Design a protein around this ligand. Structure first.
Ligand SMILES: O=P(O)(O)CP(=O)(O)O[C@@H]1[C@@H](OP(=O)(O)O)[C@H](OP(=O)(O)CP(=O)(O)O)[C@H](OP(=O)(O)O)[C@H](OP(=O)(O)O)[C@H]1OP(=O)(O)O
Ligand SMILES: [Mg+2]
Length: 163
């Protein structure tokens, strides 16, 4: 709906979410996408006009999409969805190549959460799957999902990478 908030600069959709970790920090909670039911992503969603901070949105989305409750233990900062929207799709340099200039689709504000509880019933528990994954499994899931920005957020978290 038109509750959604956008960057006044880039027009990017403002989204907040959580990298939800086990207390031992060996695993991260992932959910299946609403649009692409095969892809494993992390809980996140559009900030709404009434929400006073990104943490509110992140914990609301973590509950709604993953039935996950916990405490925010770190600000993981921002990442951008840099996915393009058929004239000149690339702007090559002399020792490198890039996709043609465009604004970000989405500006993501991520928090690290320590999981305190996982509930069986939650708003989207019939529309999504949710599962804990080690770093290596999570990394592969977010590459498979084509979401390097979500992996960047995971890499900033305290998740144990030495598997
Ligand atoms: O209807 P349109 O084609 O104009 C937009 P689309 O539905 O394809 O966008 C969805 C979005 O659904 P919507 O905002 O409720 O319409 C999802 O929103 P939901 O999770 O269904 C509801 P939310 O906005 O999170 O409260 C989630 O967007 P996001 O808000 O989680 O970033 C998806 O992202 P993802 O599941 O692929 O990661 C994102 O798909 P994407 O644009 O990434 O292909
Ligand atoms: Mg979402």
């Amino acid at each position: 709906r038109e509750n959604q908030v956008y960057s006044p600069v880039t027009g990017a959709r403002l989204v907040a979410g959580c990298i939800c970790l086990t207390p031992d920090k060996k695993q991260v909670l992932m959910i299946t996408s609403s649009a692409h039911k095969k892809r494993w992503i992390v809980p996140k969603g559009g900030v709404e006009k009434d929400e006073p901070n990104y943490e509110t949105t992140a914990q609301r989305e973590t509950w709604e999409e993953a039935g996950c409750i916990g405490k925010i233990v770190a600000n993981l900062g921002t990442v951008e969805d840099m996915r393009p929207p058929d004239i000149k799709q690339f702007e090559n340099s002399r020792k490198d190549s890039e996709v043609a200039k465009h604004p970000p689709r989405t500006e993501f504000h991520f928090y690290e959460l320590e999981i305190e509880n996982l509930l069986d019933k939650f708003p989207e528990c019939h529309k999504r799957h949710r599962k804990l994954y080690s770093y290596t499994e999570a990394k592969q899931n977010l590459i498979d999902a084509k979401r390097p920005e979500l992996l960047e957020a995971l890499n900033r978290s305290a998740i144990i990478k030495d598997d």
